[model samples]
Target: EKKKPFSVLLMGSGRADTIILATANKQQNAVEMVSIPRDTKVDYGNGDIGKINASYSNGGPSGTVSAVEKLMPGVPVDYFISINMEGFKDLVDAVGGITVYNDIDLTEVNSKFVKGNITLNGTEALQYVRIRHEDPRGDFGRQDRQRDVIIGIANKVSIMKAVGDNFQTNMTLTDITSMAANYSSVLKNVDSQELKGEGEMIYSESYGFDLYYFAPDKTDLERIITMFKKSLDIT
Candidate 1:
């Protein structure tokens, strides 16, 4: 089957953190992903008192997609994957283990782990990606760590040994095999591309108390999406 241009919005409901948007190119085995900060001020379904991550919690997938639609304007999302912390743990463990590099020294005396370019097991990987409070960049740092974990898993899972031994048991190999059998024909017709964005951080303290939001106006978002749309060859 020919590959389709699609968007995936991944979110979790537990603590309202870790939301990622992905554009995938199956033919090239390439995927581009961007992380939306959880604390991002978005129009919550329940009036104005809302955060970007809470959209999913309050109104489920449709609400979350609506919020993202407002943020991205022209870019439309196709599908969403919602996974909780437990599912995350299972997926990580099923994929065997993920490797991560620590930029700074991370040591939790109670946790009994010192971090400095270390390989993290499933549980450790979860903990590593979950710690945003102590990070200097706050949620952005968490985003980076989560992205690193994702990249690591992708890399590890690509190796033949990793594929032969664990991939089948970990994932539904039947569907994968079906896709592989049709790969060549699929690549001929479809062009693959990526999309990305950056928004300036804005604050609401000027209006009243302490609140932060993305500063870019709708025009700025449109400009960003114009480039992204071009990347995807969308008119």
Candidate 2:
């Protein structure tokens, strides 16, 4: 008998700025992750379209989950973790800081990161992920940096586990010990890919302003769904 794979959703609280789907295959000891842009369009109702981030404001975590399910039907989301800007920084700091490699220069009012291996503290990490105006790829580049921080944190936790230490400070002794094994398995092998879609900036009557909205390509979405189903061993 072997453990089956499952999916979890990670969302950034403020307007759902960051949305990531992580599917873990226990038997294979691997995890596959994908990031969805906040500005992605989603059907709200009859002839009403809204940004994916709005789902959180409208219905909280469950609303975001529903929007995600609607975006890609048949991909079962088993759990979710939602955090705000402050909590994001705290979690990174809790893991003893993270080191990420930057390929481009991110120049922002609060932070400046040059290309190379850079180590970030809690505040610095927050600024690193939030700076997008000057990035060559714009919002997409910001998403990439966020993902880098996530992967960096995951690797750090795995390293801590190898040394028989608990990485999360808030967890109770019992909970930490129980989750240690699971976390170890997930971090052992990991792979990440961005959700493929086309986006455009357009004016919307709903918001009375122009905004960016990404529409997931049908073919690309089908491919992503197929990959998840295969990983979960779901026919």
Candidate 3:
């Protein structure tokens, strides 16, 4: 009755692409996965305003953390995990590959990634999670693949090797053990969702370019805020 859910911000390396806010509630045995699109427009402090993904370049995880908190007000992130592509690849291969269902055929983002039951190695897995161009939904499709593969990955033998230089996290053993205790079960019945938005041309003076950005409405974000608040049992 006293314990609350743990919320963590998960992101990919470099510009911190592929951001997922996962809130795991032990009492509820529920894990809420909210994928925040990388291209979503956001104002990150001073002189830095554009795609939320670039917040990593300007301020790293801390920067992105605040950006996320500001974007989704009231939802405080307990921790952050920045995963490297290399580590992701090794982890996939280390676990003897993970199976993901590709509902569509593709010729551009690796020819073999046709439809149905696709087993991916390190290289293949990397390509699988990073394939944005070939898919009709672009980054949206890539995010789904990321969630799929991430949920599919699990193993201790490969984790040891993969943790070397690829994974970066602010979580302690206590945090991990406590929050991850029921992750296996939580993943089995996940309430994963995405923050929807429409595309718009936003001008960025810092980059001196007019770029297309995904702009999420406040109403859309309100539902997400509600989702986290309820899952995390926050006021």
Candidate 4:
């Protein structure tokens, strides 16, 4: 009924590995999210620069939020939730686990994941999202798995409720409990995609040696900013 959209930044790992910007567009009865890869480079004023993930190391949730706001200038991040690896696993279990399609029958990572629709427990879900080297598509594949787990969680329940124990967030329990219905409904229709960038090693004076970063394209950045602004009703 024409409510103002609320947005949040959700991080997958302690290093802020999987950065997702979720905008709950109540006006449209839908939610939209764009994944900004952890390696996405950001300028931290003056000569300081680093990948977006590192923003957590120095500034925590607020740091990550600031970095993302800089990327999408006008977009407002009303809340943030930082879920570490343990929190990820715990939340997965709290949701009674999730079902995901396994890409291969590789047995390299401790457990056996058959090639097909496989149900994963909390431990497996953690391993599944963390599997990178074997996926061939590398980080992208892992990102897919991470998103799948998140989708699985949304399919079953509100993600906020699941994180009863080990998540860092500015959102109070009341704030989370209040948005359950709209958040649950809109979450089902996600306009999700990975933020595109050119992978390169940029010289970071702070780090001294050259460091890897996902240098974003100007046009793509513009396109995403415009898209989010429109959905978020940023006039």
- Top lDDT hit: 4
Worst 10 residues of 1 by lDDT: 162-171
**Candidate 3 TM-score versus the reference:** 0.81
**Which ranges in model 2 have alpha carbons more than 4 Å from their true place?**
103-116, 133-140, 156-179, 183-189, 200-212
Q: Could you tell which candidate, 1 or 3, scores higher by lDDT?
A: 3
TM-score for each candidate, following the candidate numbering: 0.63, 0.75, 0.81, 0.83
**Candidate 1: misplaced stretches above 4 Å?**
26-30, 43-50, 55-57, 107-117, 133-139, 156-220
**Clash pairs detected, candidate 4:** none
> lDDT tens digits, residues 134-174, model 3?
88877568667877776667322213443576877787755
Clashing pairs in 1: none
lDDT of each: 0.56, 0.71, 0.74, 0.75
Question: How many angstroms is residue 17 displaced in model 3 relative to the true structure, after the best TM-score fit?
Answer: 1.9
Write the number of the candidate with greater lDDT, choosing between 1 and 4.
Answer: 4
Write the residue-wise lDDT of candidate 2 on 32-139 in tens digits.
887777777776578777778864446567678788887777788876767777766767777788899888876444566778888897788888887767788976
**How far does residue 149 in candidate 1 sit from its true spot (Å)?**
1.7
Worst 10-residue lDDT window for candidate 4 reads 156-165
Question: Candidate 1 or 3, higher TM-score?
Answer: 3
Instruction: List, residue by residue over 100-206, the lDDT tens digit for candidate 1.
Output: 67775556732444656677676777788777567777756766677667665544442233222111122243544533444332222222222233444444544
Q: Which of candidates 1 and 4 reaches a greater TM-score?
A: 4
Sort by TM-score, top down from the best: 4, 3, 2, 1
